[PDB]
Design a protein around this ligand. Structure first.
Ligand SMILES: [Hg+2]
Ligand SMILES: [Hg+2]
Length: 274
């Protein structure tokens, strides 16, 4: 019977909020509020770097824009590279509204809302928009690259590909619960959150924009072979999809190999951000 409460808690996770701000990176910023199509109010930072290009970094499940080992470094990196940055918390994370997360489904509305906000309020600073996502954020980045015409390129670090397999592996990673418990709790999580299945490999047919896939060999959530499958399929229609296989755990390439990560992603963004 405790499956019910597990299912609820996994789509209504506790909030994680850090203490640092872009001022600590030496940049002025604005605290902003972004409203989605389905009326969720998101919390974020708008960091004007005087560019006509903006990059949107997207965080993982149970995390937030503050994540010390990947979000703080990627925001610091983007600002050093000279991009404007819009960094928001996904629904039900950090300081954002929304009771439930759907770990990649309705979160496309969060990204679409951020893109609309840029175009509505700062069009001159968002003539080009790139996305960089980690984990759940990497899935949303892939979906956004396909569905949102205003996004010109994307980086997907450790993207879930087989979502139920990754979901099951996630029981241990996020909650220290057994993998076998996933099939019992998932129907409750679905019921509470309204989250619907996503055919990720379908996006291998629709993405024709530059896409940089990163996957680590020690990732316990996503197999190299799963991301390799996405890559090989997409390369049939996309000459500019790339795959970088690293020796790191889940979303920790930027932590373990910071110089390598920033070098490869920096050059990718320079090539495709206009
Ligand atoms: Hg781009
Ligand atoms: Hg990008």
């Amino acid at each position: 019977h405790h499956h019910h409460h597990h299912g609820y808690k996994m789509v209504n996770p506790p909030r994680v909020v850090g203490n640092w701000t872009p001022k600590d990176l030496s940049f002025e910023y604005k605290d902003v509020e972004i409203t989605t199509e389905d009326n969720v109010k998101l919390s974020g930072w708008w960091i004007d770097n005087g560019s006509d290009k903006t990059v949107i970094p997207l965080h993982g499940y149970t995390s937030s824009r503050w994540a010390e080992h990947y979000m703080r470094p990627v925001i610091e990196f983007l600002l050093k590279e000279g991009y404007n940055v819009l960094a928001f918390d996904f629904r039900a994370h950090g300081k954002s509204g929304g009771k439930y997360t759907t770990v990649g489904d309705k979160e496309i509305l969060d990204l679409k809302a951020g893109v609309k906000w840029l175009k509505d309020n700062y069009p001159e600073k968002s003539k080009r928009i790139g996305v960089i996502g980690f984990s759940m954020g990497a899935l949303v980045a892939i979906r956004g690259l396909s569905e949102v015409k205003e996004i010109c390129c994307g980086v997907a670090d450790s993207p879930p590909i087989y979502l139920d397999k990754t979901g099951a592996r996630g029981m241990k990673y996020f909650a220290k619960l057994p993998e076998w418990l996933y099939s019992f709790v998932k129907p409750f999580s679905e019921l509470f959150s309204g989250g619907r299945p996503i055919n990720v490999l379908n996006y291998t047919n629709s993405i024709k924009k530059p896409l940089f896939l990163i996957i680590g060999r020690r990732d316990t959530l996503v197999k190299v072979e799963e991301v390799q499958e996405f890559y090989e399929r997409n390369k049939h229609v996309n000459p500019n999809v790339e795959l970088w296989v690293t020796d790191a755990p889940h979303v920790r390439t930027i932590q373990v190999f910071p110089e390598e990560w920033k070098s490869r992603v920096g050059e990718f963004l320079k090539r495709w951000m206009g």
